[PDB]
Amino acid sequence: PRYWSLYYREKIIEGMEKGMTAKAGLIAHGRGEAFDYLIGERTIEPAERAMRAAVAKLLLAENPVVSVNGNVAALVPKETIELARALNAKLEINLFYRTEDRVKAIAEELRKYDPEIELLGINPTKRIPGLEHERGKVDENGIWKADVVVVPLEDGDRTEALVRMGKFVITIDLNPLSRSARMADITIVDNIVRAYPRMTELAREMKDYSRGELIRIIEEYDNGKTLNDVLLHIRDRLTKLAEGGIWRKKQLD
Amino acid sequence: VKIPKSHPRYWSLYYREKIIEGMEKGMTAKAGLIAHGRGEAFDYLIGERTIEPAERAMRAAVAKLLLAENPVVSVNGNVAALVPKETIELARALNAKLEINLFYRTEDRVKAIAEELRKYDPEIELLGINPTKRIPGLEHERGKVDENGIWKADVVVVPLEDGDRTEALVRMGKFVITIDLNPLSRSARMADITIVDNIVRAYPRMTELAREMKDYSRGELIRIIEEYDNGKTLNDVLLHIRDRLTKLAEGGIWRKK
Numbered sequence A: 001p002r003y004w005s006l007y008y009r010e011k012i013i014e015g016m017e018k019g020m021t022a023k024a025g026l027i028a029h030g031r032g033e034a035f036d037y038l039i040g041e042r043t044i045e046p047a048e049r050a051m052r053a054a055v056a057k058l059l060l061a062e063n064p065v066v067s068v069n070g071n072v073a074a075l076v077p078k079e080t081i082e083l084a085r086a087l088n089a090k091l092e093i094n095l096f097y098r099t100e101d102r103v104k105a106i107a108e109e110l111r112k113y114d115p116e117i118e119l120l121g122i123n124p125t126k127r128i129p130g131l132e133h134e135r136g137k138v139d140e141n142g143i144w145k146a147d148v149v150v151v152p153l154e155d156g157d158r159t160e161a162l163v164r165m166g167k168f169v170i171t172i173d174l175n176p177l178s179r180s181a182r183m184a185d186i187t188i189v190d191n192i193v194r195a196y197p198r199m200t201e202l203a204r205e206m207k208d209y210s211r212g213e214l215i216r217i218i219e220e221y222d223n224g225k226t227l228n229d230v231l232l233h234i235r236d237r238l239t240k241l242a243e244g245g246i247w248r249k250k251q252l253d
Numbered sequence B: 001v002k003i004p005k006s007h008p009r010y011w012s013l014y015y016r017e018k019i020i021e022g023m024e025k026g027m028t029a030k031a032g033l034i035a036h037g038r039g040e041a042f043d044y045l046i047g048e049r050t051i052e053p054a055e056r057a058m059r060a061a062v063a064k065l066l067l068a069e070n071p072v073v074s075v076n077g078n079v080a081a082l083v084p085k086e087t088i089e090l091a092r093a094l095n096a097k098l099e100i101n102l103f104y105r106t107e108d109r110v111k112a113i114a115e116e117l118r119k120y121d122p123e124i125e126l127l128g129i130n131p132t133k134r135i136p137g138l139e140h141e142r143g144k145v146d147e148n149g150i151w152k153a154d155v156v157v158v159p160l161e162d163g164d165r166t167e168a169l170v171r172m173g174k175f176v177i178t179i180d181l182n183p184l185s186r187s188a189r190m191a192d193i194t195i196v197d198n199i200v201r202a203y204p205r206m207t208e209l210a211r212e213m214k215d216y217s218r219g220e221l222i223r224i225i226e227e228y229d230n231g232k233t234l235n236d237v238l239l240h241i242r243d244r245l246t247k248l249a250e251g252g253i254w255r256k257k
Helices: A003-017 A023-039 A045-060 A070-075 A077-087 A100-111 A156-164 A179-183 A192-206 A211-220 A223-244 B010-023 B030-046 B052-067 B077-082 B084-094 B107-118 B163-172 B186-190 B199-213 B218-227 B230-248
Strands: A065-068 A090-093 A148-150 A168-172 A186-188 B072-075 B097-100 B155-159 B175-179 B193-195
Touching (some): A003 A023, A003 A070, A045 A148, A065 A077, A070 A100, A070 A192, A077 A100, A077 A192, A168 A179, B010 B030, B052 B084, B052 B155, B052 B218, B072 B084, B077 B199, B084 B199, B163 B186, B175 B186
Parallel strands (some): A168 A186, B072 B097
16 A cells, blocks of 8 residues: 555556557656655645636637547546546547557547547647647647647656647646746646546536636736646645654655 | 766666666566666765765664674665665675575565676575565464575665665664665664665675675674764755755746756
């Protein structure tokens, strides 16, 4: 019982056995775990704040798209489908190490929980400026024409590149200091396996809100202060751990 | 080498590639990849250098190892991928035994690791090739050890450990020294001495320390060991990371650097 930790470690490993998740993704997974260790492996209020504002924004969007990559496929294939259908958003396979067989692998896995979901990014024809070609392809009907994109667990440069295309970008990422984290319009600092079920629940509830109330939430949100507050949470936590001592303690907190 | 020498992240990126190659010679496990990522993030926070709490642990550890009856250095697939030569140098400097000791064992993995170490020392005695004995409390048999190494050991160095094994060895009465960038891991909290530093730095440094401290009297070594407090060292590491966060932040974080 670090059961959930070890559970998702296996998912990301099987993730790669099945051809969905690159070697780099396994490394990126551990980087997340490290900041999860620092946060306390739970959903903190600043991440709840950011998830509120995100779901509001995504509910008001005209052309919302949630991006899926190798890590997402391995960890939350079911929940990424729920979240999109809750938001009425399109779903676009979108990854850096693009391979035909890796898309297929992700397509199928997604089809395992919904064999009749529409998947963009199978044969993208457009591409974002300022990247590569293999890192840069997007779908004519998804990200290309999106107003709001969710890019989870992402490499820094694509987030910035989407923002300079005038996309409003929402990210889920455990690293609050990543390039991607720094550049996004809304940064949810939380483990995706908590964030996506939570955003799915928020979407179903917040649909009941007025347009006006959703716009107020969106307009009040301050991502700068939110990222500050995530750091401050971590500091205060380290201060308190250190004051109490951790050596030979079975569990922390 | 896909990146240039001027790169401000050169070594980090260098070692990322070593751990990949490692996996595809059958040395490093997939979980060892995830371990490496955990290491990157913590190294970045720490400053990608050997911090003073780390140095202080390494002195104490080198003293304890030099005074040990049966010291053993454990090797896994991450070690073999990143610091094969240095780990043999460290063992030789300490006169410690080298034992292969993995979570996901595999004569194939064990053989790749053994072969890699020989590249650097053909004559090297390696333990844990065919290990009989076992650690009380582990799965197993990821609690399997060699009867002439860790079974016999009073002091063991375990790099980048899984949590359960460190605690289990301690409950055996083994004095356990770990090298682990994650001060919040269960293993890092349960070790007797916890060196929070990248193995790529820690091993060469522990080698230099052993080469110096070989000339220390017993009295001197014992004074180093007796003064050492692993609790204050861990606390100090946490506070260092804290202070590094309130420096990487300042300016504000959002947009962008």
